[PDB]
Amino acid sequence: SLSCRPPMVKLVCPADNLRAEGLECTKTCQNYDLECMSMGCVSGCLCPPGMVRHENRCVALERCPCFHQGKEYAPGETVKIGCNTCVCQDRKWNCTDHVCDATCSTIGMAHYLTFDGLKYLFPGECQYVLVQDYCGSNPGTFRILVGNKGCSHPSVKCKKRVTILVEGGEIELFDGEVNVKRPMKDETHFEVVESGRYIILLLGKALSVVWDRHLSISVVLKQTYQEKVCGLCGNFDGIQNNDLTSSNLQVEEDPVDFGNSWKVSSQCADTRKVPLDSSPATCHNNIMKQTMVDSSCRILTSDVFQDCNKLVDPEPYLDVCIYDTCSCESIGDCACFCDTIAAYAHVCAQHGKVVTWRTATLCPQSCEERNLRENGYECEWRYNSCAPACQVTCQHPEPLACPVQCVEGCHAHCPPGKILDELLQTCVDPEDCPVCEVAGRRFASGKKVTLNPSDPEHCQICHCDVVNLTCEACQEPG
Amino acid sequence: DRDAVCTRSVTVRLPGLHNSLVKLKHGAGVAMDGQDVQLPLLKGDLRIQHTVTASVRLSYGEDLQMDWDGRGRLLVKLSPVY
Numbered sequence A: 001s002l003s004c005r006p007p008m009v010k011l012v013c014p015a016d017n018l019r020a021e022g023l024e025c026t027k028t029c030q031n032y033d034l035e036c037m038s039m040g041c042v043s044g045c046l047c048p049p050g051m052v053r054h055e056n057r058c059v060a061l062e063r064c065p066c067f068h069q070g071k072e073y074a075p076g077e078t079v080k081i082g083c084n085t086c087v088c089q090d091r092k093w094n095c096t097d098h099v100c101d102a103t104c105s106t107i108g109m110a111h112y113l114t115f116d117g118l119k120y121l122f123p124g125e126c127q128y129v130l131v132q133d134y135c136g137s138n139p140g141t142f143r144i145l146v147g148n149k150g151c152s153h154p155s156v157k158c159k160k161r162v163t164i165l166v167e168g169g170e171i172e173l174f175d176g177e178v179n180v181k182r183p184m185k186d187e188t189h190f191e192v193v194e195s196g197r198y199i200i201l202l203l204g205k206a207l208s209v210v211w212d213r214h215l216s217i218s219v220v221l222k223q224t225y226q227e228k229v230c231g232l233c234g235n236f237d238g239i240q241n242n243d244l245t246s247s248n249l250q251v252e253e254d255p256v257d258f259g260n261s262w263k264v265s266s267q268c269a270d271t272r273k274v275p276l277d278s279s280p281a282t283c284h285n286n287i288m289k290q291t292m293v294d295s296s297c298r299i300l301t302s303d304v305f306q307d308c309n310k311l312v313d314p315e316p317y318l319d320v321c322i323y324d325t326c327s328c329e330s331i332g333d334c335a336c337f338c339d340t341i342a343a344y345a346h347v348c349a350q351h352g353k354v355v356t357w358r359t360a361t362l363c364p365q366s367c368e369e370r371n372l373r374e375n376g377y378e379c380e381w382r383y384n385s386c387a388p389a390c391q392v393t394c395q396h397p398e399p400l401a402c403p404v405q406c407v408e409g410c411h412a413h414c415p416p417g418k419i420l421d422e423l424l425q426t427c428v429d430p431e432d433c434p435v436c437e438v439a440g441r442r443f444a445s446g447k448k449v450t451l452n453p454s455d456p457e458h459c460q461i462c463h464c465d466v467v468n469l470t471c472e473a474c475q476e477p478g
Numbered sequence B: 001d002r003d004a005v006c007t008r009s010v011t012v013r014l015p016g017l018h019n020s021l022v023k024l025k026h027g028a029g030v031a032m033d034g035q036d037v038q039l040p041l042l043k044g045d046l047r048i049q050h051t052v053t054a055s056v057r058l059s060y061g062e063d064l065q066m067d068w069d070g071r072g073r074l075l076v077k078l079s080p081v082y
């Protein structure tokens, strides 16, 4: 026998009460709110009613911690999930209600991640509405589109084309560079930040686009809309199982019939319902190769990603890896593999987990060619794992609205007292920037915009091309 | 194997009637408060009866159904009042 410790007292099943909830229903901090079964008690020694067990210690107060990710948190401690803080006041977490900024994506050649979060498979070869606002009963501001060619089977083929239609404009991009076919009216909101491996691209107060120069399309929207959009990315409502509402206003179950509803050209070819299987074409009846690809896609579950695997589930981003690089016949460029992992590392970076997964025998990404135009090798460009995308330059000296915390790619780093310009590849002292300050106030480096349309009598316009301290005369309407 | 974890039993609890405790056992058997029972079991609200004579079906009120937990294929039907 053993006389149990002082802090608790022994119990005895009474012969009358069936409700002998004693030793069997030992209330710990997990199972207090939970309701328990019990036949009869036992010859144990249970804590008093005013306290509970806690890891071989009958913690007295009802102050015991508030678990998340299987980790302790004392009362008062906070956690940051998304753009919200949250503190378990008593015994439940107490979170804010600031809805965060959602993000489409195109992980690989043929996959799509909606705003609310829904990976699905859609191999197409026509042009498709990725997201828009002219949906049902709305004005119809922007109509981002996407268009693929030779991309039903992922390979070194499948260059994407993207035509974004905002403010009566037509700016589009493919083959590395961005092209303006029709400039839009309010040029003030326009912006282009070619920082690193990406093309960050703002379009307004509540819209942004990102493009890795190869395939990815990550449009970022703000809290403004909240069920005002539709397209292949869904409606942005929080409900995660109504992101397959086709153009004909009904939910479908098979995504290959969904995106066929969103094609622009209603007379091109609608894609074919593929017979479902775990092995794509190359990995079909090639079980040897199917394992060499599976193992190499376990880099997504490796010692270097262990921090992020607890935050972001890798199972979506692994299914894309096995799908793409089976179908892809990678020969000279191993980009259909190295781009599916970078898409996972960037999502890990947005949640504050910078990662260095890239070595010399795996997806090297040199940066030595930018340090070549000068005969003297100054060596300022470097591959930095995740550096800020929104910095100050001769072309964009002011700080911009920054939808992306940091990004991969080649970044120019040199000692302070020098600021980067892209035309002259190196960094240069600030005075060499064509910066503009007309009549005193601080603004950009001479944007090509006609300020002050509102009042005729106060039409006091002052442009600046590069350096000139000039002001132009307004043409009177009379 | 360690990756093989099937369901053996399920326990239902109705605070509306006696605060009873139904138990669906690894066969097609049911046991209310320790007592095995022959099916059907028309109490006031809950009905328990076989379906094909190889599977039990609980039905509490008009807002709850169940299915057999013999070899582990439990179901539920919750009406929109929940």
Ligand SMILES: *[C@@H]1O[C@H](CO)[C@@H](O)[C@H](O)[C@H]1NC(C)=O
Binding pocket: A088, A089, A090, A092, A093, A094
């Ligand atoms: C959550 O915090 C709010 C604001 O301080 C407070 O009013 C509320 O009682 C808290 N709720 C819980 C469950 O702790």
Ligand SMILES: [Ca+2]
Binding pocket: A116, A234, A235, A236, A237, A238, A239, A240, A241, A242, A243
């Ligand atoms: Ca939705």
Ligand SMILES: [Ca+2]
Binding pocket: none
């Ligand atoms: Ca921070």
